[PDB]
Amino acid sequence: EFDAIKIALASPDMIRSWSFGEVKKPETINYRTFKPERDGLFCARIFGPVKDYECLCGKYKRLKHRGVICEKCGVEVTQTKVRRERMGHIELASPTAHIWFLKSLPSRIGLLLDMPLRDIERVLYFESYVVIEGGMTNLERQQILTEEQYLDALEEFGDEFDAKMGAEAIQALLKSMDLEQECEQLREELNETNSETKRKKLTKRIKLLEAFVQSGNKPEWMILTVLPVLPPDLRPLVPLDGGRFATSDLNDLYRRVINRNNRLKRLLDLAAPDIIVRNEKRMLQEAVDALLDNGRRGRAITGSNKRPLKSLADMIKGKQGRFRQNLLGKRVDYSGRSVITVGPYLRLHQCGLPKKMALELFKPFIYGKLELRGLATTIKAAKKMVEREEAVVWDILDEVIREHPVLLNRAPTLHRLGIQAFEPVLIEGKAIQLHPLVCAAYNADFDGDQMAVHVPLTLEAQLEARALMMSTNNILSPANGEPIIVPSQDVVLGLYYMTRDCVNAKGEGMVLTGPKEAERLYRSGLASLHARVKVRITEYEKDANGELVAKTSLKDTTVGRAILWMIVPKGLPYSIVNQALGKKAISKMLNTCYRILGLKPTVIFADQIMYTGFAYAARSGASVGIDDMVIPEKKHEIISEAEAEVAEIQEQFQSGLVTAGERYNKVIDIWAAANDRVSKAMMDNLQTETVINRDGQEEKQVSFNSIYMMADSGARGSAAQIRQLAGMRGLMAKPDGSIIETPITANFREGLNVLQYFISTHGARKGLADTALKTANSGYLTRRLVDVAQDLVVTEDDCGTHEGIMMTPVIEGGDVKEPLRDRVLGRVTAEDVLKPGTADILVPRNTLLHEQWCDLLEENSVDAVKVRSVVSCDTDFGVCAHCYGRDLARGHIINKGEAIGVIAAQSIGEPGTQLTMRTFHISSIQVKNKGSIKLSNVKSVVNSSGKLVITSRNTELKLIDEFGRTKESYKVPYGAVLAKGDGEQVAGGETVANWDPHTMPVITEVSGFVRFTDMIDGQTITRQTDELTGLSSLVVLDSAERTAGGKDLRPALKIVDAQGNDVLIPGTDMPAQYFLPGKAIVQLEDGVQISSGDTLARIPQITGGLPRVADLFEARRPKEPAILAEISGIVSFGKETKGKRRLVITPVDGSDPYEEMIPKWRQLNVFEGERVERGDVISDGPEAPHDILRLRGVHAVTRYIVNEVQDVYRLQGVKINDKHIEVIVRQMLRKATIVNAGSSDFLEGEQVEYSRVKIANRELEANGKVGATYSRDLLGITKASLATESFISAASFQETTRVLTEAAVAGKRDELRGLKENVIVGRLIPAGTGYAYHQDRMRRRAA
Amino acid sequence: ETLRVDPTNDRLSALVEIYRMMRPGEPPTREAAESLFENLFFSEDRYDLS
Amino acid sequence: SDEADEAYSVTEQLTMTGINRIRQKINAHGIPVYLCEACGNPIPEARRKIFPGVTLCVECQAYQERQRKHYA
Amino acid sequence: SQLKLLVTRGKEQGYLTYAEVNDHLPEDIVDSDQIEDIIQMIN
Amino acid sequence: RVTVQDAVEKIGNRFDLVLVAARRARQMQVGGKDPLVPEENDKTTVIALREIEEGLINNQILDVRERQEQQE
């Protein structure tokens, strides 16, 4: 209907154009009749009638007079709702500066006039006079003239001298300023002023100037002269009870402006002295500031309430403002709430709606269906009938309710499974009954949560409910595709109890024809629920052309596993229920049923699992008692043993052998080891009971103790709480982080005495405070990630890129923490993946790697798969459907129009709230496996004694078996003592490297004589005389206490011939001298026989939490950034200690401008003659992420972040598919800086949206001209969200005044195109089912 | 080492820094600074400790 | 999750993190150094019987603790 | 220059207390209106 | 109807399914039609998915039928 929203500056003629009159009196109403006045603040001639189609006078009160204007009071007969939209104006008697355009911090008026803010705020409050086109009378235009200076400079000059003060001065400055004339002269001086600050200020001003000409606004419109008043229905005067009233504070601010303008009108009618009119104009200007923004000038004036008033800026800006609190967070008809109960008779797709709530919610539906069937004639008759709730309106309502979903929603809606649609089943009572499987998807328990239920009215929203939001359509977690409808606690106790064997149960060793015979035997009481029998099992396998090949065998199972086999569908084997079936086993069983059979049999299977689990958990009779906590009998001995140990260390601290700090450390360690001992004793006492038998002998078995049966099944809780029940409680913490050294030797099956109970409350109170403080900040990160990723929607089917990250699992040292089948599943192959024979294509290209393909490439032992990633997608304002991958909440490939930015924001935020809200930090190589060693950067030398020491820098270790995949991955030190040779497959149990951090040698390449030239002790070395053996040591110094005669000069480690001829470098015509950085332990002599690789100069020696994923996305610069090798080439040092060392990497074929200001406190990894390429390590520690993007590719900060963020998630144990961090990163670094502006239409120092760069460079290379190159920039997720395109969207999460002033002066437009834009505006989103509507409207524009 | 930084050395210039910490800008008179300070911690009508 | 189970996870993270941060400061296995690393004093043999790997003596470590009591 | 060191110290540590601004105000200004205008300027 | 799985695979897109079934349910509810699949006392938006399930309503079949309704 409007298609775009355009912002500008209001013309004074336009302000009078909106107006329907002028407000002249500050009266609001009549005070007696409560009537609107003749020309007051709540006027009726201006804004309209108080009653619908009725004059204020009373004459033309008839509905026949609609549209006429009465002659007695001047009102127009219209609706009274027209005074919701009618403005008036206030013609101010003096001009007055808009405080939005002055006291903004860029201060558009100040930046425009080429005068600082102190200038204009001095002139505006009547201090200084200002020259406006001052002729040629010895002056400067735009100059401050203070009052006495203006007076004595008016002397000797009969010219009228053109010096005003106040907003008349600034208005005549803004009018007489030609913008384009100044643009041409500014570009003229820009032709001749290539400096840094000068050119920076000139282009910085010329940006706002070129925007101001191309916008169409006038600079004199920033100085206000006529003031718009709001409609009276937006600052109402509602009559409350008892004669009392209630107004808005804008009434007081408009009353202040009307008062001061009327009084200034009189004071300029009266030819008053100038000081009181100066004070009146300054007061009226202050009143306009308090009206438009009460507090940007200072201070925010309070009325008869001691809070500040809410102004117009405060009515758009703020948490309670219309932009935040009323454009999205808004109450909703056809909605209600009540508490949740279980009611597990339900299916997965129904909720239990109460009957009074369904009578209330579905009222117009009931009326239409009740009068369509004609049991009432009038809608008044329908109203009286269903108010009476007769015996027929329940039949009509259960007809209405049949297939009509209700959106059940619980309040902390962290992700999209907080809203699901359920078919309503009418129950009595007043509580919503809710299927027990989805309680883990809402995080909704039954200690009194209430679920809000909405109704979808339209057929489009009914079908959106049924097709997306039905609880059976969403059974995979959208974070990682595992099922979220995992059976949680009673179902897993039932499924664990029926399927866990007993050694001698009733009915042992029988042979049954199948599960029917097993249920018949159990239900008649002839066999126990778990007795090892031989059941005949028909298990179907679709290991053919979707066949379901059947096969019947004779399995060795228990009775209850056979009974549970009946609810299994066909495609699953029997070995999935032939086990204990704890919690993870039911998760894997439902996952197997989904991966094999699809969506519907998983829903029927999960329902039958829930029914069977509740039923056999009921028939379990699984109680809990006081004899289900068996206290270990050795607990007294371990407690007495630890008390004897801490008595001994108390003695040896009384003897002064150890201090109190080590004594506290020793007793903490002793009591913690004793607590582990007691827990081990009780956990071994609990998990093995003695049962007897088929033959009457003693036979251990896993105990049926109900507390062990709850802990081991994964029903509720784990062995730590069983430690606090039977074993000892342990050492208790403190809010200081410290540990109370007197532990709690008691437990909860015994009691706690008063001291231990007072000790426990520090840790428990700190835990509950941190819980209840975290829930007040639940989705702050989800909000901060939907701001950055609002407008990312899948728009393309296949953009067709060839790039992408190449995915390899996390082998950190030994094991692999997360394999390849976790990552490469669901992603799209960016290339053709060949076999390890490098001969045949395994998966072609553009393929959805499902579990069959990933099973195939894991059978083929493939290791280096290049997936299609989101950060390398070739489409604009969106991703393609293949560069994302698959949906993960459905298992299919993604659809066109899924809002994956919001989905990934939620799938980082909702698993992210399971992380800790406070942060927490925590010889020879252990060679275990055998195989072949692979080395990259491998340049090793032989030694004489057979050992090896590697002289290349980054030769890190890779062990391969005969499978292709990496086995042992480690960093080899620079010259550690290897027993590893080269390439030869070794056996495990033999050290490959004997490292020592005291050992970093400068081991030679060739053998020879290390004679020393340019070597003077005293100004280059220290006098090191090792009395230890009596050796000649020359340990070189830093730039600390040597002379400056040998500071820049370096001592030579020159290895020469037996005669003394300078041996060459193999490959390089330079000499053999290895000049040394600081602190090298040298044992050498001039002329000693040493071999190649001799130890000449040895050098001496995981955070978790939600704040880490806060700081990983904000992309902080760490205080110890590991500096890099900025450019490829061999290295040299630089200037010694002007505060910092320099270091000139010199490329052998390129220029070397980089002598980097390296502090001497961060010691070199490298030697100063050691060739390192670009993107290579210099310092040691946390690598800064911006340096990864500048130096290495965009797949190296993509691989850095989504491995560093997942190192926080996998540390706690929370799994998440790494699509979700990649669409946030893809929206993070969508800024490029220009460096070669070329024939492209951008400046040099220009940061712009990258996908506008990549399309101009697409088109300006599509001509016969050449396009720009760009250096990618990466920003924080509070700063990437700042540079949005929209201004309606940007004013909802950023500060509105700085946004709306920046938007107005640019004359900006908003073609809407965004999720938050159209949600505010009231249209369909451009994401979901409203993508095609934004096709249907982007069809009609290319008409 | 806090005497090694302390620019004042006797009580007349000591009340100067105290009066210019309380009320800046004004020239500290020899009675105006001292009558502010002695009434600040040692007089019942300003410094009440219960 | 009953609002006193997330309390339980926070409290167990507190106790386990603090106790591991203490037990990492026990320096269990080491070398018999026989001489302190800031004084060169002979560390008595019962002290190495208590702690294997004390590079500091008793009272120089006591001075280290007293210096580290505040920070810096 | 002292208020410039206040700007640099605030952006160098990420926060400002009342003690740090009150130690980095000049010597010439007295009353509390202008100094909390300066607090808004830095705020 | 419980799940729209056959319906979303018979169209190929989940949101255009919602739009097509919404158009068909509008024709069946207020447009004036008859159900193509027999309605087993279903609401109007379940008949639309059971017409999409049997291949009887897609976008082009609905559009050529709109052509035929204009043809008279």
Ligand SMILES: [Mg+2]
């Ligand atoms: Mg609860």
Ligand SMILES: [Zn+2]
């Ligand atoms: Zn009238």
Ligand SMILES: [Zn+2]
């Ligand atoms: Zn793509």
Ligand SMILES: [Zn+2]
């Ligand atoms: Zn010592």
